[PDB]
Amino acid sequence: AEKDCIAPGAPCFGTDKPCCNPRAWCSSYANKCL
Secondary structure, three states, X not given: OOOOOEOOOOXXXXXXXXXXXXXXXXXXXXXXXX
């Protein structure tokens, strides 16, 4: 039941969407929001 944005340390890689932070980029390096 996670929100639209990617939670901290959450696998962001998969929805082409960054973290909830307006300056957090995706971290496919380790599949997670950077």
